[PDB]
Design a protein around this nucleic acid. Sequence first.
RNA 1: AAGUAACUUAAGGAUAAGAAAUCAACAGAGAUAUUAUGAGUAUUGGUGAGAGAAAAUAAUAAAGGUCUAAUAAGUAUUAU
RNA 2: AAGUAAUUAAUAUUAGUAAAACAAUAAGUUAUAAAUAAAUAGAAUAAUAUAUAUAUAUAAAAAAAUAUAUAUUU
RNA 3: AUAAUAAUAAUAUGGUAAUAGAACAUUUAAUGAUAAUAUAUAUUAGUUAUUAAUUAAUAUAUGUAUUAAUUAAAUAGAGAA
Lengths: 220, 53, 104, 62, 106, 252
Amino acid sequence: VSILGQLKPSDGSTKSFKRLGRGPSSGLGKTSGRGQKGQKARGKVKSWFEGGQTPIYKLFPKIGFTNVGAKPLKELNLKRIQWFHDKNRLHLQPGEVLDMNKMRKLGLVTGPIKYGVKILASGKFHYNLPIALEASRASAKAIAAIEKAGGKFTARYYTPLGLRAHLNPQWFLEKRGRVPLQARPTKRRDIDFYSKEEKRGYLVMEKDKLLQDIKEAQNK
Amino acid sequence: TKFLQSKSGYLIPDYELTTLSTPLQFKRYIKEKILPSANDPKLAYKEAEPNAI
Amino acid sequence: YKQYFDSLPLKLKSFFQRYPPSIKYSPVSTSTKAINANPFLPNKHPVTQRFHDPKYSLRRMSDVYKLALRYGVEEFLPPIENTKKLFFEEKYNKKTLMKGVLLP
Amino acid sequence: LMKTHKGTAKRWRRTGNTFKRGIAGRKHGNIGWSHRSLKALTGRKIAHPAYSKHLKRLLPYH
Amino acid sequence: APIFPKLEDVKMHELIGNNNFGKKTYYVERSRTGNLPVYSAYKNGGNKIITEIRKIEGDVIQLRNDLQEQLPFIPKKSWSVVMQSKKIIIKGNAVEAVKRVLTKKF
Amino acid sequence: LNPLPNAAIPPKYALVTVRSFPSLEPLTFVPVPTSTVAAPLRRDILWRAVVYENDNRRVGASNPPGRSENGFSRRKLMPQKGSGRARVGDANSPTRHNGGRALARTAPNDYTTELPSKVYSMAFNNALSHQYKSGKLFVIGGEKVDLISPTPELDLNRLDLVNTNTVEGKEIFEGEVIFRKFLEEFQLKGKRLLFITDKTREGLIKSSDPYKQKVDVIQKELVEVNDILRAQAVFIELEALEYLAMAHQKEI
RNA sequence: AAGUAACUUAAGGAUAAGAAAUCAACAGAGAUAUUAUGAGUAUUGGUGAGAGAAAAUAAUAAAGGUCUAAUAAGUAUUAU
RNA sequence: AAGUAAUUAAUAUUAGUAAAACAAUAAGUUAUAAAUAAAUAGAAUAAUAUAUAUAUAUAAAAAAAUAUAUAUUU
RNA sequence: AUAAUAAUAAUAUGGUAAUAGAACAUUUAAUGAUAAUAUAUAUUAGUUAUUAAUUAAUAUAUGUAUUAAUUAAAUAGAGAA
Ligand SMILES: [Mg+2]
Ligand SMILES: [Mg+2]
Ligand SMILES: [Mg+2]
Ligand SMILES: [Mg+2]
Ligand SMILES: [Mg+2]
Ligand SMILES: [Mg+2]
Ligand SMILES: [Mg+2]
Ligand SMILES: [Mg+2]
Ligand SMILES: [Mg+2]
Ligand SMILES: [Mg+2]
Ligand SMILES: [Mg+2]
Ligand SMILES: [Mg+2]
Ligand SMILES: [Mg+2]
Ligand SMILES: [Mg+2]
Ligand SMILES: [Mg+2]
Ligand SMILES: [Mg+2]
């Protein structure tokens, strides 16, 4: 005979749903688990209705603000990179840098990279890779570990569109026959960050034109 | 195996063919499965009642 | 060559049909009655002395220009000098940074 | 679909598998009281387990 | 590259019913990314930790016995082999030890 | 000294015989991988696949009228007190005999459940393996592959009957007759059959139509787990089988 | 609750909308309509009850652009 | 003649896959790091906390709190 | 190192509100032998620790169980309005 008339679920998968209002010996008899006679017995009071006392969403003062200007980077630890390298998944030709796009391709970072990647230092001891990295930013300790390894970090600015283009340049080419140009940092805070040598920002490390233009303006 | 099937009149299943590594093994299988059913048609395997005795 | 031209996107093809490249259209605003009147610029009507809105509204013009850039057919389109829009690499290069960027 | 209780969201913020909140009783009438004693009420506080379930129900996407 | 190879290149030992894989032997296949299928699992609301071992082909009982022999420090009781899906559950977070034991062969 | 003594490498290829259609004649073996055609028969996975498919299939046309849907007036039939009878509102109540249903469904009811794609693929493989084990998986081909025994003169390598549409002498036609002969030969007249084609074999389906109640001709893309398992014997094209394998292979 | 029920009026096989005085953010996109994600996010509330976008990416979609206006004044804008 | 359905959220059990999962058109959700109102900050300088990370504070420690580290990442 | 059944020793087995676990009857969908010597329904008397089903007799229908079993579900069980 066909298997189709002898298939069961795996043991522990299914259950019988508790069926109310269906006789006394059932257990869930006349009252059907409701108790006896109140508002909850025949009607609806809200779960978090605290009775009339000042509730736990009212006693306490409202705290903080939502920074809409915030753009949370996805964190990538050096440890994970090292592990990838050990596994022989970190496929890089000599000279080619491990950029955010490259990380995504490899599966170092996974899921949607909306705003960028920060490189943190959770396995800085056993990190020994002389490859060059490039991300939104890195932890100071992580940077130091990279330097020790014989590597080279560069914090690179990416607007959300620019980041997207970096991650998936072929899509833009397919759609429009042209990948979009990478934007300059318009914001003051961003400019300041990438102008820091301590952060290994690209504007100082590559000696950018924007920074020079700003200096000229200041002079004049 | 094709020759054996042709002479026999019966079809030896693909899984069985894959499994059995010798002519002797094939013969033994034939003796086990097809032969008794051929001898006695009431003893043969029925599809709707696979757990028959 | 003809087949390659045909293979061009629709809007661009339509533009070429209705404003062909044999006519050297003006860089500056002109009379609306003129033959060399640029469809991207706002041309003045000679009797009423009112600036007519561009024959190709600004979005459409931009799209056409981007299509031309894609297929390398920019110079056959009429000039977009006096329309304030720049595009892509030229825009990037020619622009001055904002006062806020240079002088916070 | 279900939605967050906005007042509760304003009052409460996530901290791993709990919610943190501000202290009550430090907005006026502070003069006269001991400053050291008052310093107890300045910081934050983790949710009491009694109302944790309620908080979860209020904030389904936290 | 080809899903079904040609009849010439396939050896006899590669086929089913050869080399006696069913009788008292086993295999433990690695994951897609290429790691040992041994996992911590935090059941009953983080209260019950257990170590799960997946992707076992062949005789699971034998494999379990071999692992017990390798790791005498874990008790005999705490080795629940669920037969429907063929995976062997251990009580503690004994993942790393299991991996160490397996690595040398799988 | 020896850590895992009983470790070993599993077998990876099962041989399926490639046949000519009208008469199921062995042309070649083809080694299909063990994962497709000889997986361990996990019933639970198979069950999951079947139930999900059944749920997807659902029409869900149950549409009993609730007290709103039901078409009485909203008027109170008897005044609350001073009637000498029980309290009543409108005539639509579930309590009364002509009134609408309590907790009434409203069509079209959506019974669609979800399954992980990998689980579904595994189930598909599993069903196929079970079929192979049974001896109910007839792979027909020989066009692409290199043969051992040559194809017969009156058979053909694809899954189809020749000159089915031709019907000159009598109302009876040849493809139907051939099919009947085939059925007679392999002792599967009343048995359920499942012909998994690659491309649309119009002549085959025409031939089948007489035995439409038991014979189900399906494409390579539209074939289901249910279809495979219900079948008493599946007749799959080699190319179609390859395609299925490719579809439901575990990715690496 | 809700611009809902209702009443009233007027049209067509559909109507409405539609080729940017639109979005966006120094990079860019390119009419409108419907759906999915974005997102119960920003936003807002006797800051109670509760209400809640857009950009962007996907589908569905059709050839989707195209002049018919001598380029628009009691109009934009302002106060209320 | 009475605990039903839809859209959601949180738990649990099993099953699939697993440092990834779902989805494969891209995009997204969850996980992979803990914090903080928020900010350009983020886990052993030579090992278990006596080290480190964050918030308060600070020259830097200490101090409260939570988190991170003892062939193989969870 | 399991499951079923059976021994021995021990402890436990009243229960409203409530919580948890396990079954059965009914109806539909998937798979599905068989047959008037059969099946279904009813009555009566037996049987099985028994809301259930089964045996026999009797009656009426039907050339026949969407039947046993496993799953999926429910307008799934009424002395209480
Ligand atoms: Mg009770
Ligand atoms: Mg009371
Ligand atoms: Mg009552
Ligand atoms: Mg009560
Ligand atoms: Mg005190
Ligand atoms: Mg279901
Ligand atoms: Mg309103
Ligand atoms: Mg219209
Ligand atoms: Mg105008
Ligand atoms: Mg105007
Ligand atoms: Mg006004
Ligand atoms: Mg400070
Ligand atoms: Mg009791
Ligand atoms: Mg009922
Ligand atoms: Mg009754
Ligand atoms: Mg009763």
